[PDB]
């Protein structure tokens, strides 16, 4: 019924409380895995629809290749309940693993896909080839887990393409990346930084890895929001995926992979959450409005029930989903808290002092600003409000993000900024040994999760690099500006 830990002071328990007490998830008694209740799934359905539309515009074609992961990752269920997640249940009776270990570690159809691709691509006429699929996997949950965020249970999407060029493929990679950005912004009202990964933090089979980075202020921790890989000809060469060009001479396809996950949900939740509880941006909230009757002393309760039902009509007629809470058992206060907690964007309160006034009151979930509004304005005003709540969420989020970055030019400044829950943006020479040197040094200077500072991304929107500038670590000429930060 209420939230005991304050977000800014006991973050982890705050998150726990919020997601279980907001009817988002439900834990099974066994395996520590959770049910995505309608409340949670709805979000996924929204972003899923969005993505599908947008990649259809990109001539991506949905499909399904059976997922493979090495047997070893599924043993904990095999011993505990003798059952596996249905999407990868075949991989046990498979026996010996195959082929490269670098991909078998993670559930994917890449192992299968790449295997059948050379038979699908023989001519240049067969390119470009653009596939997508939606996946769900669940393994025996971590001992100390964080739903959406640090968990073995996932619901995600993975795309794969093959091209005649590198230009084609890379363009595509960044197109997808910007779709992930829109994914987070237009729908989860979450801001992210577009960037390229350090050579040590990139995917090994990748030429380069582009990422969307998000940042949790209350933790002072960054977390990867989405990834788009330019794979190059690595796996073409590896799997003999060649085609015959227009001049009719055999050449290697250029591939890309990309994927975003239910992680996004958790990230959203961490971005907008109150001590009051859940705050959904309206696009991903099943009900946009809850309608509450306020009355204690005896009155025409019927008159109100009707007035309210009239508002509910006005709105459900605009395909704006409402819930009217006329429960007799609970105080108007109880209700307030109950739906504030479940993350409903707008609450309309109806009072006897509003039926003779023919108005009502509307309250925003995000800033709890109240206002008085006439009945005929209700629909309009509610709409404009549902837009504004979103813009506002995205703003406060963005500001927090912007405030969490410190531009340093030397290592002196680093640790300070770190302990203030900030990430730094620093002139790096991007040489590799320095990654591990910086990890080890920053781990050694700090007071679950790690304290070592990792290179997160080289952001696409680069600050000018002075001709002089040295790497804040090596003292070599700095190559580019890089985000370092503690992370998930």
Question: From a second copy, Cl ion, none, which one binds at residue 143 (CB under 5 to 8 Å depending on kind)?
Answer: Cl ion
| Residue span binding a second copy (CB under 8 A) among the ranges 7-15, 69-77, 160-168, 293-301 | 69-77
Report, in Å, the least distance between residue 309 CB and a second copy. 16
How many Å apart are CA 50 and CA 361, to the nearest integer?
A: 33
21 exposed, middle or buried (CB, 10 Å; 0-12, 13-18, 19+)?
middle
Nearer Cβ to a second copy (245/369):
245
From the list a second copy, Cl ion, none, partner contacted by residue 30 (C-beta under 5 to 8 A by kind): a second copy
- For residue 86, the partner it binds in a second copy, Cl ion, none, with Cβ less than 5 to 8 A by kind, is a second copy
| Dihedral over Cα of 370, 372, 373, 375: its sign | positive
Say whether residue 125 binds a second copy (CB under 8 A): yes
Judged by CB under 8 A, does residue 442 bind a second copy?
no
Q: Distance between CA atoms of 157 and 135, rounded to whole angstroms?
A: 6
Shortest separation between residue 71's beta carbon and Cl ion, angstroms: 11
Member of 15, 51, 65, 336 binding a second copy (CB under 8 A): 65
What does the alpha-carbon distance between residue 107 and residue 280 come to, in Å, rounded to a whole number?
30
Residue 233 Cα distances to 103, 195, 208, 248, 487, angstroms: 16, 22, 12, 19, 31
DSSP-assigned letters across all residues of 299-367: --HHHHHHHHHHHHHHHHTTT--EEE---SSS-HHHHHHHHHHTT-SEEEEE-HHHHTTTEEEEEETTT
Nearer to a second copy, 92 or 367 (CB): 92
Phi, psi of 361 (to 5 degrees): -125, 140
Check binding of 412 to Cl ion (CB under 5 A).
no
In this structure, what token pair is assigned to residue 435?
């990654």
> Is the previous residue joined to 416 through a cis bond, with omega within 30 degrees of 0?
no
On whether 262 is known to bind a ligand per the annotation, the reply is: yes
For Cl ion, the nearest residue by Cβ is 143
On whether 263 is known to bind a ligand per the annotation, the reply is yes
Q: Nearest Cα to 241, choosing from 254, 228, 222, 224?
A: 254
Count how many residues are written for the chain.
Answer: 488
- Residue 263: strand pairing partners: none
Q: Closer to a second copy at the Cβ: 139 or 197? A: 139
28 binds a second copy (CB under 8 A): yes
Q: What is the C-alpha to C-alpha distance for residues 271 and 265, in angstroms, rounded to an integer?
A: 10
Q: Is 225 annotated as a binding residue?
A: yes
DSSP three-state, residue 129 = strand
Q: Answer whether 294's CB lies under 8 Å from 307's CB.
A: no
- Chosen residue from 93, 119, 143, 444 binding Cl ion by CB under 5 A: 143
339 is in an annotated binding site: no
What is the rounded distance in angstroms from the CA atom of residue 223 to the CA atom of residue 229? 17
| Per-residue contact string for residues 28-67; x = within reach of Cl ion by CB under 5 A | -------------------------------x--------
Q: Does 142 bind Cl ion (CB under 5 A)?
A: yes
Binding site partner of 144, from a second copy, Cl ion, none, Cβ cut-off 5-8 A by kind: Cl ion
* SS3 per residue for 348-415: EEECHHHHCCCEEEEEECCCCCEEEEECCCHHHHHHHHHHHHHHHHHHHHHHHHHHCEEECCCCHHHH
* Span 396-415, contacts to a second copy by CB under 8 A: none
480: Cα within 13 Å, side-chain hemisphere: 16
Q: Which of 29, 79, 144, 433 binds Cl ion (CB under 5 A)?
A: 144
Counting contacts by CB under 8 A, is residue 155 touching a second copy? yes
Nearer to Cl ion, 323 or 361 (CB): 323
We find the least distance from the C-beta atom of residue 121 to Cl ion, in angstroms, to be 14
For position 187 contacting a second copy by CB under 8 A, the verdict is no
Q: Is residue 333 classed exposed, middle or buried when 0-12, 13-18 and 19+ CB atoms within 10 A define those classes?
A: exposed
90 binds Cl ion (CB under 5 A): no
Query: Would you say 115 or 217 has its CB closer to a second copy?
Result: 115
Cα separation of 192 and 61, whole Å? 27
Task: Establish if 140 lies at the interface with a second copy (CB under 8 A).
Answer: yes
Binding test (CB under 8 A) with a second copy, winner from 69, 176, 322, 458 = 69
Q: Is 154 one of the annotated binding-site residues?
A: yes
With CB under 5 to 8 Å by kind, the binding choice for 94 among a second copy, Cl ion, none is a second copy
Tell me if 346 sits within 8 A of 389, measured CB to CB: yes
Reference 438, options 453, 423, 449, 456; nearest CA is 453
- Does 84 sit near a second copy (CB under 8 A)? yes
Q: Is 449 in the site for a second copy (CB under 8 A)?
A: no
Q: How far is the CB of 319 from a second copy (least distance, A)?
A: 11
Q: Which stretch binds a second copy (CB under 8 A): 34-42, 212-220, 339-347, 395-403?
A: 34-42
Residues flagged as binding site for L-proline: 139, 229
Residues flagged as binding site for ATP: 139-143, 150-154, 224-226, 261-263
Contact positions vs Cl ion (CB under 5 A): 59, 142-144
Contact positions vs a second copy (CB under 8 A): 26, 28-31, 33-38, 41-42, 45, 61-71, 77, 81-94, 112, 115-116, 119, 125, 131, 133, 135-141, 153, 155, 286, 327
């Amino acid at each position: 019924m209420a939230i005991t830990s304050k977000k800014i002071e006991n973050f982890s328990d705050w998150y726990t409380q919020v997601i279980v007490k907001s009817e988002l998830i439900e834990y099974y008694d066994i395996s520590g895995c959770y049910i995505l209740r309608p409340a949670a799934y709805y979000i996924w359905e929204c972003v899923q629809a969005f993505f599908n539309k947008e990649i259809k515009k990109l001539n991506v074609e949905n499909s399904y290749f059976p997922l493979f992961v090495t047997k070893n990752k599924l043993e904990k269920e095999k011993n505990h309940i003798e059952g596996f997640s249905p999407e990868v249940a075949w991989v046990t009776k498979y026996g010996d693993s195959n082929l490269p270990e670098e991909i078998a570690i993670r559930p994917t159809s890449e192992t299968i896909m790449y295997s059948v691709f050379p038979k699908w691509i023989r001519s240049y006429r067969d390119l470009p080839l653009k596939l997508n699929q939606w996946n769900t996997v669940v393994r025996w949950e971590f001992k100390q887990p964080t739903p959406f965020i640090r968990t073995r249970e996932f619901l995600w999407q993975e795309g794969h393409t093959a091209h005649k060029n590198e230009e084609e493929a890379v363009k595509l990679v960044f197109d997808i990346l910007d779709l992930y950005r829109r994914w987070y912004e237009e729908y989860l009202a979450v801001p992210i930084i577009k960037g390229i990964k350090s050579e040590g933090e990139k995917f090994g089979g990748a030429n380069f890895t582009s990422t969307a980075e998000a940042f949790i202020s209350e933790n002072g921790r960054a977390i990867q929001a989405a990834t788009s890989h330019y794979l190059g000809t690595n796996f073409a060469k590896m799997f003999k995926i060649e085609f015959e060009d227009e001049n009719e001479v055999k050449q290697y396809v250029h591939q890309t992979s990309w994927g975003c996950t239910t992680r996004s949900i958790g990230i959203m939740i961490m971005t907008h959450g109150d001590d009051k509880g859940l705050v959904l941006p309206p696009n991903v909230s099943k009900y946009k409005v809850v309608i509450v009757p306020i009355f204690y002393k005896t009155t025409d309760e019927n008159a109100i029930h009707s007035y309210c039902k009239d508002i509910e009509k006005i709105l459900k007629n605009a395909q704006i989903n409402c819930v009217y809470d006329d429960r007799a058992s609970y105080s108007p206060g109880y209700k307030f808290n109950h739906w504030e907690l479940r993350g409903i964007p707008i609450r309309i309160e109806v009072g006897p002092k509003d039926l003779q006034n023919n108005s009502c009151v509307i309250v925003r979930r995000d800033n709890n600003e109240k206002c008085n509004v006439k009945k005929e304005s209700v629909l309009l005003e509610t709409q404009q409000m549902l837009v504004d709540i979103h813009k506002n969420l995205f703003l406060k989020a963005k500001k927090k993000l912007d405030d969490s970055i410190v531009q340093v030019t030397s290592f002196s400044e680093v640790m300070n900024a770190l302990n203030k829950k900030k990430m730094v943006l620093a002139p790096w020479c991007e040489d590799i040994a320095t990654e591990e040197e910086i990890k080890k040094e920053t781990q050694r200077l700090s007071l679950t999760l790690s304290g070592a500072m990792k290179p997160l991304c080289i952001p696409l929107d680069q600050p000018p690099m002075p001709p002089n500038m040295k790497c804040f670590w090596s003292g070599k000429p700095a190559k580019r500006w890089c985000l370092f930060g503690r992370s998930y």
